[PDB]
Amino acid sequence: GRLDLPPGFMFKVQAQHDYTATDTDELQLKAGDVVLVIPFQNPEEQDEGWLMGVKESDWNQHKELEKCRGVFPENFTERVP
């Protein structure tokens, strides 16, 4: 994982279970994926019970951030130190 991190970065999480993104803001996760938590582009876009981030490997490959990021069910992941 990386220690040079995305703009406004808050903390990381790690997927405990796998998740398939159903809709047009949502992020895809595999059980074991680190996700770099970031703050939202608007407060109305923050869904209740959701988190926004980008996958750490998606960011360690240095891909298009604004297309690689998404919202995920925080309850699929764990807060890592």
Partner: peptide
């Protein structure tokens, strides 16, 4: 067995005439 469930997403940017 024992899998989590994603929570309900909410309305935003709503506007009508």
């Amino acid at each position: 067995s024992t899998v989590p469930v994603a929570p309900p997403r909410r309305r935003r940017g709503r506007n009508l005439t």
